[PDB]
Amino acid sequence: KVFERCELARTLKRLGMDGYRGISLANWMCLAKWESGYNTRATNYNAGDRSTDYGIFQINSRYWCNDGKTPGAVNACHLSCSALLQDNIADAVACAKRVVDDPQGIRAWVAWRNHCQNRDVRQYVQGCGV
Amino acid sequence: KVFERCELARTLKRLGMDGYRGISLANWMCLAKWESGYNTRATNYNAGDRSTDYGIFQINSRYWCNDGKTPGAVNACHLSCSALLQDNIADAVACAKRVVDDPQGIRAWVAWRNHCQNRDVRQYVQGCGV
């Protein structure tokens, strides 16, 4: 499923993301845009370390979810990576929350550091009524 | 099912968890948060002793439930582990109560010792009307 911008904004808001760990809804939106283009089925296999990023937030199988095929992996979200490839994003949202509860917060995502951090992101939520 | 925070709090209170063996509702909430993110379908395989943790409270197959795949296991809750992956959490609540009946109580969960014990956990029930 590819979310439309405002559709995603309302969904994330409904799922308790707006201000979670001091992270605005617009920031979560910017993260989803740059990671997956709002695509819940997105996957990115890294031949380098044989890990894969899953779903709308591109969560990595080396540390966060289990795909049963990543060397030296842990499963900190206690969840199958397939749960992060579903149209219903509740599991993905729960796991993203777990990620930012770690010390480095949303900076865990290099794409967010590069394309969102310190920048204007107001346009992600503009006109969504959230 | 992935519970919303306040929905889970009210559900646990309804199932008689608040004050069970001296354990506050907020402590059960913190446990669930750091085990599964309130996800009834969470699982975690432990290569160490070939056991798996099941469900919202991440209850282990070596001692507490039967998954038919864990060597030398016992089934103290008298439940198949599949019952602990269901939307209805009555069985999971009954099993968590049984776990904390043992001498170490809630300290059985290492995630709880690391993320909850001795810390302020009022945030977990704030605004829930419980």
Residue numbers in the entry:
A (entry chain A), B (entry chain B): 1 to 130
What does the study report here?
Human lysozyme (hLYS) kills bacteria by catalytic hydrolysis of cell wall peptidoglycan, but also exhibits catalysis-independent antimicrobial properties. Its dual functions result in a protein that attacks both Gram-positive and Gram-negative bacterial pathogens, and hLYS has been shown to be the most effective cationic anti-pseudomonal agent in human airway fluids. The cationic nature of hLYS is thought to play an important role in guiding the protein to the negatively charged surface of bacteria. The dense positive charge of hLYS, however, also represents an Achilles' heel, as the wild type enzyme can be sequestered and inactivated by alginate, a biofilm matrix component associated with mucoid P. aeruginosa lung infections.
Among other functionally enhanced enzymes, the Arg101→Asp and Arg115→His double mutant was found to lyse bacteria effectively at alginate, mucin and DNA concentrations that inactivated wild type hLYS. Iterative model building and refinement to 2.04 Å resolution yielded a unit cell containing 2050 atoms in two protein chains and 237 water molecules, which was in excellent agreement with experimental diffraction data. The Arg101→Asp and Arg115→His mutations result in minimal perturbation of the global enzyme structure, as demonstrated by a superposition of the double mutant model onto the crystal structure of wild type hLYS. The mutated residues are situated at opposite ends of the substrate-binding groove, and as a result they have little impact on the catalytic core of the active site. The mutant Asp101 side chain forms an electrostatic N-O bridge with Arg21, and is within hydrogen bonding distance of Tyr20. Even more striking, repulsive charge-charge interactions cause the wild type Arg101 and neighboring Arg21 side chains to orient away from each other. At the second mutation site, the His115 side chain lies alongside Trp34 in a parallel displaced π-stacking interaction. The corresponding values of the double mutant are 8.9 and +4.9, respectively. Consistent with the net charge shift, the overall strength of the double mutant's potential field is substantially decreased relative to wild type hLYS. At the same time, the two mutations manifest an expanded negative potential field in and around the substrate binding cleft (compare Fig. 3c and 3d).
